[PDB]
Each structure stands twice: as structure tokens, then as C-alpha cells.
Amino acid sequence: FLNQITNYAKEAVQSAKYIGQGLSVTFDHMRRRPITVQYPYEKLIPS
């Protein structure tokens, strides 16, 4: 009865693919321009 061994490896490889996908999409966050309003040289105008 190997119904819980293959399910175990399936859960492991689904978590591995989830970690690989989340690692690919957190690597697409570094390419975005930072939204930091750099205060002493970029004082944001009040309304």
C-alpha cells in the first residue's frame, strides 16, 4: 500500500515547485525601481 508514499513525494515536489515559483517571482521584485522617498534630499511636497 504505497498510496501515502507517492502522496508524500507529491506533497514534497509541490512544495518544491511552490518554493521555486516564489523564488522566481521574488527575483522579479529586485528589478523594480525603489519607491523610497529619500527624505533629506527628496523631501516630498505636502498637499
Binding site: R33, I35, P40, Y41, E42, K43, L44, I45, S47
Partner: protein
């Protein structure tokens, strides 16, 4: 804030024109959203 010669001043969100979310990519002082009440009086 706009008259200090060490600051690049940034309009926050409600003064960025009509499609802009962050005021960092602003090219040269583009205005708030669009027309003002001295325009529809000339339009209609």
C-alpha cells in the same frame, strides 16, 4: 520645500497626472490631473 537647493521635491499621489502612481519618474513638472474650472467655462 520646492525652494531648497538640496531637495528634489516629489508630488505624492494626488498631484500626478491621470495615470501616474509614483512621483519618481516625473520628467518635468507635469501637473495634477488635468483641467481646472477656468477650462469648462471656455469649453461649454
Amino acid at each position: 520645500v520646492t525652494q531648497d537647493p538640496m531637495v528634489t521635491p516629489i508630488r505624492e499621489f494626488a498631484y500626478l497626472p491621470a495615470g501616474v502612481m509614483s512621483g519618481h519618474d516625473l520628467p518635468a513638472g507635469a501637473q495634477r490631473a488635468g483641467e481646472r474650472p477656468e477650462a469648462i467655462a471656455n469649453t461649454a
